[PDB]
Amino acid sequence: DGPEKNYEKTLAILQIESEKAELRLKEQEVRRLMRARGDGPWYQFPTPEKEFIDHSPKATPDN
Amino acid sequence: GWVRPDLGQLSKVTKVKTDRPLPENPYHSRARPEPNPVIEGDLKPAKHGTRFFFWTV
């Protein structure tokens, strides 16, 4: 086919690999920041549920 | 002229009328910090596949 086909294919391959490397580094930094301070969707450790707290009036008023 | 209550009369709710204002903050609750900023958007596919080493797809 000629040298231009291999040239442009190499450029496309390099762009794909560079974007993948950038995204991998971004993923590492995002995971580290989330686990350091959990504020995104990931590393959300559980907590006792609100929906099983009895809010009805008790036998004792001081509750 | 007093009448003794029946078998099941003293043991029911009463709906007493009062003018004392309703306490707006029982238990002296704190600020209740806001939840995490949930991410919204369309679910696009993963960029360049799984990006797991040499796997292209």
**At A3, which helix (H) or strand (E)?**
helix A3-36
Give chain A's radius of gyration (CA, Å). 27
> A17 is written with which tokens?
């690999």
A47 Rama sector, left if φ>0, alpha if ψ -120 to 50, beta otherwise: beta
B51–chain A Cβ distance below 8 A for any pair:
yes
B37–chain A Cβ distance below 8 A for any pair:
yes
Interatomic CA distance for residues A14 and A38, integer angstroms:
35
Instruction: State whether A24 and B36 contact (CB < 8 Å).
Output: no
Interatomic CA distance for residues A40 and A30, integer angstroms:
9
CA distance from start to end of chain A? 83
Q: How far is B1 from chain A (nearest CA, A)?
A: 33
Q: Which of A9, A15, A16 to mutate to test the interface with B (most CBs of B within 10 A)?
A: A16
Report how this structure was experimentally obtained. Answer: cryo-EM
- For A19, B31, B36, the CA distances from B43, given in Å and listed in that order, are 19, 34, 19
A46–chain B Cβ distance below 8 A for any pair:
no
Count of positions (residues) in chain A: 63
Say what the resolution is, in angstroms.
3.0
> A61 is written with which tokens?
């008023």
